[PDB]
């Protein structure tokens, strides 16, 4: 989506809250206003863990797209069609 509230956009906001942990430390050398978020996102171990979460999110969506489709088949079509078209089909 990227709009309103969605299971991904919530899990996106969740995922974020752990990267937000970078800020709280506020660096141990050089400049005071520095972050760690950059370094944490270069670490290979975290990428793999982040990429594994996204793979599992795309699994459910496909089987949920098959689950919803079942009802959609006969049922979407009737809400699209009008009463006049129903009249034209009859006579």
């Amino acid at each position: 989506s990227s709009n309103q509230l969605t299971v991904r956009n919530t899990i996106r906001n969740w995922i974020n809250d752990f990267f937000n942990i970078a800020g709280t430390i506020q660096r141990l050398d050089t400049t005071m206003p520095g972050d760690f978020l950059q370094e944490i996102r270069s670490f290979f171990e975290i990428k793999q863990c982040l990429a594994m979460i996204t793979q599992n999110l795309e699994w459910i969506e496909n089987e949920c797209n098959q689950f919803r489709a079942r009802f959609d088949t006969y049922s979407y079509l009737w809400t699209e069609d009008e009463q006049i078209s129903f009249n034209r089909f009859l006579d």
């Binding site: 990267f19 970078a22 050089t30 972050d35 978020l37 370094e39 290979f44 990429a51």
Partner: protein, 529 residues
């Protein structure tokens, strides 16, 4: 027509999805090697490592085949986030990488495309092997997510996210090397530096000493400002042309266009934050923006066709990707990257704005009855054979004989138009009629009047018949002869079938004579005589 179109990969061994991967065209062959493969088939025993696997890229009629080359001489070690560039059309090096986060390489490793053999360069990298801290011989301090621009006989690296020992930061500094010997010289500009950034792109602009460094990232705060650097006079000039939104970990490729060289940035992560704190929210943009170097300005580009979807079917953003451009087919192609997940989907697009090498026409105005030869200019214009231009357009289809004066110049005669309406000029070849913004053409008193004879200029007019001959230039015109003298001049007038006049004159006196010839109550080019 410009539109994003997915390309299906069909090979014996297709490449697995990656993030730390770089693609660089060299001669007529595009070669990709890259690491960070989701699939633990490399190292294993806990943690993900890079793969040092090379792959060739071939594409024909929108169909790609992948072909990896195991057989080399030496092998380099597995890299992730590692700037590569091309020397000449043979010698591809790669420099700098990463290995289990804490270890970072600072060793160059050449590859000869024709032999697909790697090598260690002279005695510059005697002993490689993986190590947290490497600071000797080589000037540059080990770094990942950096950038390498190639120029005539010299490679330049500006990129960041790295340091000696355990320290981690972005680089303010530019390290030069001379490929002829592989000597590492740090070059400090006299100009006031740009803020230290890592995870960007840089490339030479318009085949000039200036190279431009857009986007980037740093522990302090992300940046999003272009910064050029001419090797001549050392000090960098600052355009100070920024983007709308701050961008980082993008991927940009240079494109040749004769009128004005164009640069194309795709993917990356954007976000606007105030100094320290937060920075956590990371939006990724699919929309690739377009820069012209002669303009120095960022103009966003839109899809023309939706392919009957009735909605823009663009690829995912993919943050850290790899994009390479073909000068043959005039298209930019990006393999994939890391938009949170890993994906193996090669998406291309053909650039409408770039065309095989005017722009402008002169004259753009003409009379219908006349037959003049114009001059259409642009770029990628074929010489003699294949060259074909479109005429009229105003409720009509016309094809005019074209001749290429240059590769940026095409001569063609104006077609006889019945109605004085709106005229449009195109060009035919490629898929159908590959053109830009069409060259706009716009189609009784005659300004043309040609005269020559011994009855004009100095000649003293005697009893003898002093002759001239005009041009009719015809369907209602007037042609008034006038011979003022001291005595009574004779004056004849014979309209011939050669499309000319024959006006003699016999003045009886001789003192300083001068004959005026008017066409529609207006003097012809020549006066007096």
């Amino acid at each position: 027509p410009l539109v994003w179109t997915q390309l299906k990969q069909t090979g014996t061994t297709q490449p697995t999805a990656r993030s730390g991967h770089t693609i660089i065209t060299v001669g007529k062959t595009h070669i990709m090697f890259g690491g960070l493969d989701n699939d633990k088939n490399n190292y294993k025993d806990g943690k993900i490592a890079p793969n040092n696997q090379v792959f060739t890229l071939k594409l024909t009629q929108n169909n790609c085949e992948w072909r990896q080359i195991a057989c080399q001489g030496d092998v380099p070690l597995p890299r992730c986030y590692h700037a590569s560039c091309a020397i000449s059309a043979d010698k591809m090096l790669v420099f700098g990488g990463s290995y289990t986060s804490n270890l970072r390489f600072n060793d160059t490793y050449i590859l000869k495309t024709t032999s697909y053999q790697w090598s260690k360069p002279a005695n510059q990298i005697s002993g490689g092997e993986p190590k947290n801290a490497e600071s000797k011989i080589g000037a540059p301090q080990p770094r990942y997510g950096h950038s390498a621009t190639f120029f005539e006989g010299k490679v330049y690296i500006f990129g960041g996210h790295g340091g000696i020992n355990y320290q981690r930061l972005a680089f303010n500094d530019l390290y030069v090397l001379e490929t002829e010997n592989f000597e590492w010289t740090r070059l400090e500009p006299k100009g006031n530096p740009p803020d230290p950034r890592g995870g960007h792109s840089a490339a030479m602009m318009a085949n000039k000493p200036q190279l431009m460094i857009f986007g980037g990232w740093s522990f302090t705060s992300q940046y999003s400002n272009i910064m050029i650097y001419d090797i001549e006079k050392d000090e960098w000039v600052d355009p100070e042309i920024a983007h709308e939104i701050p961008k980082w970990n993008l991927s940009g490729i240079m494109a040749p266009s004769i009128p004005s060289w164009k640069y194309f940035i795709f993917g990356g992560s954007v976000g606007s934050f105030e100094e320290g704190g937060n920075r956590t929210n990371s939006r990724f943009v699919d929309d690739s923006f377009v820069l012209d170097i002669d303009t120095l300005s960022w103009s966003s580009i839109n899809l023309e066709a939706d392919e009957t979807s009735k909605a823009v079917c663009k690829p995912r953003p993919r943050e850290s990707a790899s994009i390479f451009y073909d000068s043959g087919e005039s298209r930019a192609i990006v393999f994939g990257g890391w938009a949170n997940n890993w994906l193996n989907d090669l998406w291309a697009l053909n650039v409408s704005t770039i065309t095989g090498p005017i722009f402008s026409i002169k004259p753009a105005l003409g009379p219908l009855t006349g037959k003049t030869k114009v001059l259409i200019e642009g770029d990628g214009f074929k010489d003699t054979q294949n060259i074909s231009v479109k005429f009229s357009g105003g409720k009509l289809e016309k094809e005019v004989n074209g001749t290429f004066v240059n590769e940026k110049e095409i001569s063609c005669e104006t077609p006889t138009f019945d109605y004085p309406r709106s005229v449009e000029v195109t060009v035919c070849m490629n898929k159908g009629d590959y053109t830009i913004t069409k060259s706009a053409f716009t189609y009784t008193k005659a300004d043309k009047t040609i005269a020559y004879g011994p009855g004009l200029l100095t000649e003293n007019l005697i009893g003898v018949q002093t002759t001239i001959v005009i041009q009719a230039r015809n369907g209602s015109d007037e042609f008034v002869v006038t011979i003022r003298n001291p005595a009574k001049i004779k004056k004849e007038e014979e309209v011939k079938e050669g499309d000319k006049a024959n006006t003699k004159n016999t003045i009886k006196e001789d003192e300083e004579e001068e004959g005026e010839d008017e066409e529609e109550n207006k003097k012809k080019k020549e006066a007096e005589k």
